[PDB]
């Protein structure tokens, strides 16, 4: 029997990527997606005619609010109806967006960013161990934590909270069996609204190649940390970021 | 005139003798408090006494929710109604208890852990900027990457609290404003834990086999905001006694 | 055409088991030795009747001396004598023992643990880059930041190594050189511990209450070296079980 | 009884302000130098023209060999010989220059740059605790570390190794009531062979003041540090860069 993982905003880009290497190794996989519907219907119609019920999607708005535990909760269940197990989590969906420090609302812009990236993660992480072999939670961080973009304040809070809940999830359910592990990209696929030219900006900061990660390369990595080869790895954050954290100013 | 200080919960232990402390060096000082207004007030007396109208007290709940930023940006109005200035901001106040991942709801601990921790020192570091040697202090924590057991909102609102310090030491710079934090080890225990476990931990600390009292933690609070820290911004000094280094 | 790999101290424990599982998955491998001349050459012999000629022994301390760089220079081109090529380095020759700041004169014990663990890796480095999917992997260790007790030289090797790891990934990146970092917190406890010793850092592991294997150990440096990782430099994987996680 | 401080590489730049601020403490100094004897004496002379009998010098190479024990014995011994105690120990003196991967032999470049960095910082806090109230040792690191300097493999190892002896060291070192912690400057007095064009590019990147910290801004860190004010301080580093580290490429 093929196992189960949750990957939450995976119908399109990194998440997509990651989705797709997992049911290529044989998972069958639960598509989380807010926004996306036609991506990720599409997506599961491309995986299910691979192999079929292997596929299926799951909607769910991961902004902070007091029902989003029960949302979380949810996103679980809805693997274990699928497919009646549920192996391995990825906590992928993520709000990026400025907030300098001198629209929306800043209560709004709070529940966004910090609940997508660390307080949906921390939810999910809760359910998935309650919901309870080679069990893993593999959470997208970011290389760029301790050299964070100008006025992004909020969102690299967030990437700190999961820095600090991958650790702390590792230590406490590790008893368990299940193992908590990062993933850190610096520059893979850039912002759909990025000019070609700021692209290129940071595609020359990058030592390895001058250039971003595909998301295939991410993946890749998501995918070592879930396997049999990684069995004794838990709290690791593993960076893909081809050097770009290691240059100076 | 005196420079003037905002430290929150400043009413007792860490926050009371940074206040004090501060206002020795010559500050003039909000002493911000939730629920201990009895100790806030006698706090405020005793500094009062000292130097006439240099102490002001200031209620305000530092839970995340729909009136925080509004809270936030009181607390640092307070600050310029009762001294026109506000120089220095303390991040103190902290909620502090276990959440296991496998009594108060679940939502209810993320607003208070997130939001004391991490959201409410977001907002007051936003009010403190927008309302302009100016420096914001972080209260940390030196056990950040040895996170005690079942105590993850709290490890994450910690964490967060040190993305806060760098990415506002970044912003602010061109400001004048530094952000830095003060990492305690253990510090003054638990009111609530009991003997035993209280010193369990103070056998663990090399330095001296003995917790730090608060004035040592204050005493780094002092040096942040001085002139012999003029070019420290985004750097967090441990206040340990070299526990972090300790293996398991 | 098949790849060429140097493994330092490859006659026992996880050095052996980086050796086997490289050889595995299809590179010609050099066994560096120091004293287990038997051991290496009993390994080199096991290899060769899987595959000919796939495996060949190389004899040198690493010890830091002034015939250190020359004898670095002698095991990079010793691979490439045999091979006609040199893909992958990995650094896994490691001197360990206590150096009290309050036997061996200091002098030897700054040369035997500073050389093995960081002076030797530097010059492999230079000569590994100088000779050009090419990679490095360090053998580093997880409880860097929370160290042994009195074991301060060794400490200091394995921090320098850390650095080596970042600067030689910045600055081998253009030559398409990665370099990276396997940190194992608990692997293959030493020969004549006592099981009861065993046992306490055992305990210590939350991960199933173990050790890692060497060939857990190896399978990190397995993936480093793949077209898996081809986008991954200067980046150092804990495979600790979360023991550098623990407080004390 | 005034108490004693160690400097090395006291003669010019931060070593020498390190120097003048611990005096000005009221701390009797020993005057390391290697090769600025004019300098370190002209210096003593200052010294000791304000406070008769409280500064010394001491001339060591702390290149990496076989005597190098015994030259940080010395130095030790110096302080002991002069003021019948010590103190504070302040590990200052540094070899900075570019060893490129791909004019000195490697051997002797190997030498200077990990002994001056790193093995005399180890053998001086041996030789200072050998001999052994506020006591103190401080490391004079580097903010830098982790995003180095392109070619600067062996320095960045030494200065690496340095950050792993504060910590080794303030471990051991606290049954004996000795604190051991690190200063680590970002962008401070520039080398005088760099280029005026260099300066200013390095200068600009510098978030707080878009310029560098004076020695004396370094020397404050350093003093707070070994004064009552840090007694429950061992095994920190300062970071006095004005947030250079937290500037991404
Ligand atoms: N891309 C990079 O260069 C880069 C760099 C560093 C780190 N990372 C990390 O790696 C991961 C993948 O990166 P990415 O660029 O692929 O991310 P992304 O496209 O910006 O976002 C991924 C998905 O998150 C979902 N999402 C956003 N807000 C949500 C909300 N409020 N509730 C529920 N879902 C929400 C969206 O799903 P819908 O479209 O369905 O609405 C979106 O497709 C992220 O966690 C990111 O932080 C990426
Ligand atoms: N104590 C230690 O050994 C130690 C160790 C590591 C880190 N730290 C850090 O150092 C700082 C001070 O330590 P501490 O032990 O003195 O802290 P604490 O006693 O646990 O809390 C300090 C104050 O925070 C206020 N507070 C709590 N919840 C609040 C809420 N929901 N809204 C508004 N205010 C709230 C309280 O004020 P009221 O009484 O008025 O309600 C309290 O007096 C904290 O940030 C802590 O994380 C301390
Ligand atoms: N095992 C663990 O729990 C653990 C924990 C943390 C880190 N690590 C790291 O992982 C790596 C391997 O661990 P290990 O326990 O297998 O190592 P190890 O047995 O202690 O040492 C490996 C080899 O190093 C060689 N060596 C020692 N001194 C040398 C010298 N002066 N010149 C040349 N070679 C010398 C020896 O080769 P010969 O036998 O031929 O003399 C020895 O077999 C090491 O880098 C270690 O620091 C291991
Ligand atoms: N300046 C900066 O922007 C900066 C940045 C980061 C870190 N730092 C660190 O802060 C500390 C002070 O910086 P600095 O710029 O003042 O250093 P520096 O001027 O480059 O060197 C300090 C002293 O070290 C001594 N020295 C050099 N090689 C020696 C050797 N082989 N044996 C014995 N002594 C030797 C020299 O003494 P003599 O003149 O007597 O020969 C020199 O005066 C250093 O540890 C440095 O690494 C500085
Ligand atoms: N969710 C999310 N999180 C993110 N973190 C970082 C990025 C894109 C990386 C980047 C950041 C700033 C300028 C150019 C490229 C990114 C993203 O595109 N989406
Ligand atoms: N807000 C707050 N935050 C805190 N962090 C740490 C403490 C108490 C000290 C301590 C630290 C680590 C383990 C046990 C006890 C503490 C506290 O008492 N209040
Ligand atoms: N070279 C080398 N380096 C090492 N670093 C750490 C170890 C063994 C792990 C250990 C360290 C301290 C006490 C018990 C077990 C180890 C080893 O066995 N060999």
Redesign the pocket.
């Given at each position: 029997e093929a196992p189960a993982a949750v990957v939450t905003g995976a119908a399109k880009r990194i998440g997509r990527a990651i989705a797709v290497k997992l049911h290529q190794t044989g998972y069958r996989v639960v598509i989380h997606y807010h926004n996306s519907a036609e991506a990720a219907v599409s997506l599961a119609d491309e995986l299910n005619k691979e192999r079929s019920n292997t596929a299926v999607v799951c909607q769910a708005d991961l902004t902070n609010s007091n029902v989003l535990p029960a949302s979380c909760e949810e996103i679980i269940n809805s693997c274990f109806r699928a497919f009646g197990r549920c192996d391995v989590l990825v906590n992928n969906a993520?709000?990026?967006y400025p907030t300098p420090l001198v629209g929306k609302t800043v209560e709004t812009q709070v529940a966004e960013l910090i609940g997508t990236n660390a307080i949906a993660p921390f939810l999910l992480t809760m359910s998935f161990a309650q919901r309870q072999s080679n069990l893993s939670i593999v959470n997208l961080c970011?290389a760029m934590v301790d050299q964070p973009?100008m006025a992004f304040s909020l969102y690299n809070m967030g990437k700190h909270a999961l820095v600090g809940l991958t650790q702390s999830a590792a230590l406490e359910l590790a008893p368990y069996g299940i193992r908590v592990n990062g993933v850190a990209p610096g520059?893979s696929?850039?912002?759909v609204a990025?000019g070609e030219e700021?692209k290129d900006k940071?595609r020359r900061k990058v030592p390895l190649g001058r250039r971003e990660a595909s998301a295939e390369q991410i993946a890749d990595a998501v995918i070592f940390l879930v396997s049999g080869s990684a069995q004794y790895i838990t709290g690791s954050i593993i960076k893909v970021d081809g050097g770009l954290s290691l240059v100076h100013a």
């Open positions: 993520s709000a990026f970011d973009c520059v696929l850039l912002p990025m700021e940071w």
